[PDB]
Amino acid sequence: HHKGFAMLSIGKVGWIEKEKPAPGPFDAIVRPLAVAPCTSDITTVFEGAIGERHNMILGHEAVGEVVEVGSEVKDFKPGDRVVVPGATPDWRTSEVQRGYHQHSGGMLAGWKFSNVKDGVFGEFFHVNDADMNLAHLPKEIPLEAAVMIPDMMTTGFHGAELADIELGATVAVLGIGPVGLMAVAGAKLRGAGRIIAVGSRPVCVDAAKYYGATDIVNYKDGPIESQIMNLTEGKGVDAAIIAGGNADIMATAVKIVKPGGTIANVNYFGEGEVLPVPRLEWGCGMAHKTIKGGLCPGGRLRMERLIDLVFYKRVDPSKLVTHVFRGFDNIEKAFMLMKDKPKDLIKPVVIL
Amino acid sequence: HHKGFAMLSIGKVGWIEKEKPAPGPFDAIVRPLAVAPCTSDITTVFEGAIGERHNMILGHEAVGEVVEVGSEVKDFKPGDRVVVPGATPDWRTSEVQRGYHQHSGGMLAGWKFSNVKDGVFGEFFHVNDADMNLAHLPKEIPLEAAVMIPDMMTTGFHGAELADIELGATVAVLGIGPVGLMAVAGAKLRGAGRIIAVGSRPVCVDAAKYYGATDIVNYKDGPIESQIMNLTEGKGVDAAIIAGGNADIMATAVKIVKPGGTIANVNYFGEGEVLPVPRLEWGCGMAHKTIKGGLCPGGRLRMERLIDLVFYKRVDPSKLVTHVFRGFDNIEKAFMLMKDKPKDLIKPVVIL
C-alpha cells in the first residue's frame, strides 16, 4: 500500500491509496526526492488530453532514490540517487531501431508516467528497464535543479536540436514558459547568435534574458511577425522554436522563418482539428520551410548528457524554479499552482 | 523584335510582339527546340496565382539552341544544344551561401521564367548567367525526353530527396501526374522498396507501374488512409511524397506516415489560406513527422546530374510525353491542353 495524488476522473483530483508497485526483473522501484508538476497534468485532468483515466497517479518529473531492483538490473542499487526521465520507453521495438524511442510501441508511447502507468506523485513509482531509463545523479546538483532535467530541459533542448541551428544563426523562441526558457538556453548551446524571445510575463522575460535572449518581443506592442520582421530587417529568422501558444502560433512561426529555415515545435496543441500552415508564407508549398514537432528524448543516455551540461556549468536550470515546497502534502498545492497560473510562476518543485 | 505566346492579363492569352532580348555580359540568348506547358501557367493566367502580369511570355520548360552569348560567357557558344532548367537563379546572393538557390534573392525567386521575366514560349528567351544555368544536351537524348528534365524530373526527384528515404523503406506518392510519376521514379532511385502510388487516370496508373510503383491506391475502393493502412498492415509508410491534390491532401499525408517519418511536398497549392496539418495525427505537435516543402532545384549542376541519369539509363522520362505537336502555332494547343485536362494527358511537348 502507498499513497499518491491521482486523477480520479475528469475535473477531479485527490489523494488515493494504492498497491505499492513491484519491479519486474529489469525494473526498479524509486521513491521521490523531488517532483514538479507539469502543464500536461493540468491538461490531462481538466481537458481530457489523453482520454479517460480513473485513479491514475499524476506527475512525470521526478528525481528519486532507488528502493528495489529486479534480479537482472545491473547498474542500479537500492540507495542510488537517480534522475528519472519523463519518457521511459521500451527499448526493444522497431521504432527504436528506426531511431525514435519517443514512439516506441506507438505514437508518443515512450511517455508512460501519468499516461499508461501511475505517475511519480506517489510514495513510490515504477521505472521500466532501469539500466536503460535511469541516470545517476551527482550530489553536486541540487534536487530542485535536477528535477528540471526529466522534461523541462530535455524538451526545450530538443526544440533547439530540431531547429538545426548553424553557428551565428538568428533564432526565435515563441513562448517562454519553462520549456521556452530551456529552448533559449538550448539555442545558445547550439551556437545561436541573436536569440529573440517572445513572451510578456515579467518573471519569464527576466529568465529569458538570463538564458541568452537578446531581444524580447511583447505581443502587446503589435503583431509578433512584424516586430520580428523589423528586428531582422526583412530577413526573417533562421529557425523558430514553438514552445507555447494556441494552434495559430504555427502560422506565426512560418511567417517569421526565412525560406530554407526550420520551424521546430515542442509545444503540445490540445485544441483544434488543424494547425494552420499559411499557404502564401509557406511558399505555396515550396518555401523550404521545414516543420518539425517532436516529443522530448528520454532514457538514460539523454539524462546523463544533460546532467553533464549542468555538472560542467553550461546551463543552470535552477532559475526556472520559482516555488519550492516541502512535504508530500504540498504536491496538491504545487499542482493547483499549475492550474491557477499566478503571474510570477515559472516552475514549482516539491522537496521530500 | 520577336513573337511569343504570352499572358495578356488575367484570363486572356495570345501571341504578342516583343523586342528581341539581348544578353548581359554573363547571359545567353536561346531559341527553343522543344517546349512543354505547365499546369502553373494555367494557374498564373486563369487564377492570378502570382498576381497581375501584362504581356509576359509563358512557359518555363525548354531545351534549345544557344543563339547569342554575353561578352563574359565562357562555356556556351552559339550553336550549342542546351537543357534549360526551369529555375535559373541569381547565383550571387546570401541564400546561395545558405544553400537555397531556389530562393536566391527572395522566396522562390530562383524561378524567373514566366514570373519575373519572359518565359520560354517565344522565338527566343533570355537565360541569366549562362555558365551557371545551362547544361549541354547530348545528341543521344531525344528532345521530348529532355524537356521533361527542366521541371518535371527535378521536381519529382526533389520530392524523393526531401523524403529522406532509407534503403528498403515504404514510400507513398500522393498524386501521379508527371511530377508524381517522377517522384515514383525518384523514390526508386533512393532505394525505396515498396512504392504505393495514389491516383486514378489509367494513363497515369500505367506510367506509375512503369516507374516503379508496386501498389496502386485508387480513391474508388475507399478512403486513401484506410487503403494504405491495409496495405501496410497498420504500420503506415516511412515517407509520403505529395505531388498533387487539394490543400487537404496534406492531412492525408500526415495520417499515413509513421511517427518519425517524413512528409515531402513538391506540389503547388493555389487555393485556400491554410494548408491543414491534423493536430491529432501529428501527435498534437510531437509525432516527429517532419513536413518539408520545396521548389525544385535548378542551375547547371542539377541538369548535368539529371542528364547523366538519362544517359546512363537510370530513368527514361519519355513515357511522360503523351502528346507531341510540331508548330509554334501549336503552343496554344498544348497550353489549352493543360487547362482542359483530358484523361489521356500526362504531359504535352511542342517540337520547334
Add this chain to the structure above:
Amino acid sequence: HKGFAMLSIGKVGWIEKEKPAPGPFDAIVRPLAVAPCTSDITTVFEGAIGERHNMILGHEAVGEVVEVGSEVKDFKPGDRVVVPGATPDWRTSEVQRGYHQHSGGMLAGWKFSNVKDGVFGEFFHVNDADMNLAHLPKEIPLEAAVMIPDMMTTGFHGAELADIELGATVAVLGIGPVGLMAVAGAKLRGAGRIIAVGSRPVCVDAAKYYGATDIVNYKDGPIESQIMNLTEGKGVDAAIIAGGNADIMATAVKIVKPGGTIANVNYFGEGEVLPVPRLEWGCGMAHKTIKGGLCPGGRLRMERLIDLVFYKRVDPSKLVTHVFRGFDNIEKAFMLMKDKPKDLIKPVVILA
C-alpha cells in the same frame, strides 16, 4: 548437436557439443542455407580475433525457428527466418547513441563465430529473437536470402556511407561479393555513372549486371590514372572501398573530388596504418570525408533488405556461383574461400 568448428590456428572439423538452450528472449534456429565468409578463413588460418577452441564457424544463414524463450512474442517454432550476421545486444548505451554495430564494444554487434558459436551447426542460438530475426517470405529462394545477412547489408552500407547524390559519379573499388552489392547499392541511391574496379570475368560480368557503367582493369595501368582519365580530371563524387590492401585507401582519396566521401566497408587485416595521402587529402583540408563501418544488423535492417529483394529492386542470386547440398559440403564450401577459384563469387550450402 554437431557443428563445423575452428579447432585452432589452421585446424577445422565437425565437433559434438551441447545443444544450445534459449534464454527467455532468445530463439534456437536450425539452418536452411548457409554461406561461408572470408572472415572465417582469416579467423581460422591467421588468428585475427585470437585463439578459439571448438567454436562453430559461419555467420550467414537463413533458417527455421525450432524453439523460443518464454518472452519471445513475434517468432514461434516453424518460422522461416533470415538471420542477420550482426545480432547485437539492443539494451546498451551505444544503441541509444545510434550504433548497434558496436553495442557493448567495438564491433560487439558481431557475435556469430566470434564470441559465440556460429551458424555452421545443426542448431544455433540467436539472442533477442524479436529484435534480431526477420520473417522470410516463401517467394524468395534460400540462396538469394542467404546473401542478405552480410553481403547485401555490407555492400549497401558502403553506398549509404558514401552519401551519394542523385546523378553522382561513384567508384566501387573491388568487386567481390560485397563490392558487387556496393555497385547495386550505389544504383539504388541514384548514382549515374558507376565505375567498377576489378579483374575476374565472373565478377566484371556481375558488376555490369548490378549497374556498373565502366570497368577498370588494374592490368591496363594504374587505377588512379584510369579513373582520372575517365572523368577528365574531375574525379568521382564518392568512392566505396570493398576490397584490396591497405593502400587502396590512398587510391580512394586520390580519385574523389574535394568535398566527396570515401566509404569503406572492407576489412583490413594487415599493416599498422591505413595510408591517407596528405597532398591529395588537401593537407588535411580537402573536405574528403572518410567513413568505415561494420554492416548494420537486427530485424529492421533485414526486413528492409528483404523488401528490396521481394519487390525486385535487387536480385542477389547472381552472387551465388556454386550451390552445394548437405551438411557435408560446409567444409568444402568453407575451404573454397581460403583460395577462391576464379569462377567463384559466393557459395551456398542448402541443408533442408
Add this chain to the structure above:
Amino acid sequence: HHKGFAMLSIGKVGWIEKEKPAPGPFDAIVRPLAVAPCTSDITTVFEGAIGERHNMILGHEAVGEVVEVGSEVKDFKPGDRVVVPGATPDWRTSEVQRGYHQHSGGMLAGWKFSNVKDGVFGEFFHVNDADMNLAHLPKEIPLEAAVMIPDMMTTGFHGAELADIELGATVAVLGIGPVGLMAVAGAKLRGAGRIIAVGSRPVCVDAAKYYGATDIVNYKDGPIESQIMNLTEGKGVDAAIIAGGNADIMATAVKIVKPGGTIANVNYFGEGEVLPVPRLEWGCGMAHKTIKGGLCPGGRLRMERLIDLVFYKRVDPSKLVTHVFRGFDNIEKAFMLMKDKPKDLIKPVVIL
C-alpha cells in the same frame, strides 16, 4: 604603386613596392586597419608549402576600410569598415553548386590571399566580389577582436562543426594554438559538456580554460592517449578536433574517439606523404569513426554570422591577442614573432 611585406623566395622575406591593384566591376580595393600574421605565412616562406612564389605580398587576415569599388558593387561604398574573410572564393563555379566554396575552382582554391594573389600585408589589397566576400564591421567590435574572425575563428569553429557534437558530448581538442582555442570555444557553442584540451604552453592552457576547457592534458605527464582514456574511464571521447601536431596526431585522435564518434581536422599538415590511420583502433575499417578535414569557410555570410557571435557576446576572441603593434613598419616584426614563436605568444595584431 604601393608597398607590401612580401615573400621574395624560399626563406627570404622583405619589403617590395608593387602596382596598386585595380578593382574589377564586382571587386573592391581595401586598405588595412588591422592585420595579423598566420602560421601559414611562416610555412609558406620557410617550407615552400604552396610552392615557389616571387614578390608575393603575404598575409590573409585583415579588417579594413573600403577605398574604391567597381561599378557593380551594390552593398559596399568607399569608407565602409569591413571584415575580410581569409577565404574569398569565386562564387560562380560548379563546386559552389555542390556546396564547397572552399574548393571553388580547385582544391582549396577558395583561399586566394597570399596564394594566387597578393595578400593583405600592403597599403592596399584587392577583394574579389565585394558583395559576396565582405562583411560590414560594427563599431562596437574592436579591431584586434575582429581580425581573429577572418581565419582563427572560422577555422576553429569549423572544427567544432565537422565534429558533429551532440548536446552534452565529451570533446577532445588536440592542440591549443589560436585555432585550437577557437575549437574549444566552438565546441562550447555546440553544447559540449566536458571539453578536454591538449596543450602545454601556460598562455594557451589558461586561454583554453577561459574558452570552456574542463580538463588540460599535458604531454609531459605521459601519453595523451593513455591520459585521455583514464579521464573518460576507458570510454573515450565522442569527438576529437585536431588543431595541431604531427601526422600521427591523426593516430592519436582515432585511438581516443569512441566507436561511432567523429575525428574533425582543421590543422594544416605540411610534412610527410601519409597521415596514419591506425588499422586496429579504426575497427580494421569498420569502427564507424568518421574522419573529416576541411578548409575554413569564407565569404560574406560566414563573416556576418561570426560577427554576430562576437557582437552578442557569445564568444570573445580578444584574449587570443597577446601582442599589439602600431604601424605598417611593424608587420615585419609581427611576422618574425610567428617565426621565432616566443612563448607568451598566441596571436599578434598590427593596428594601422
